[PDB]
């Protein structure tokens, strides 16, 4: 019992923590386009 | 078997949540940034 619960845990947690480190980058590229995107609304502001 | 699979867990588990560790503070301060030049932009709108 104890060890194919361990299994059960290994698996669980590998894919769980896999899909957040899929995930994260995609958050910091997004609010770097977005405070680029507002750089540009305070440049076309100053126009 | 289960020990070194045990370990396998632990290294794997410590070194994503070490990565996510790394990432959560970029986001948090990312976030405020954007708040700070939505507030600049707004100020500029004023003007």
Redesign the interface.
Known sequence: E??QM??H??AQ??AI??T??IY?PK??SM??E??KQ??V??LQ??F
Chains 1, 2 share one sequence.
């Open positions: 104890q060890n361990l299994n845990v290994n947690l590998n923590n896999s957040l480190n994260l958050i910091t609010l770097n977005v405070m507002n750089h609304l305070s502001i100053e």
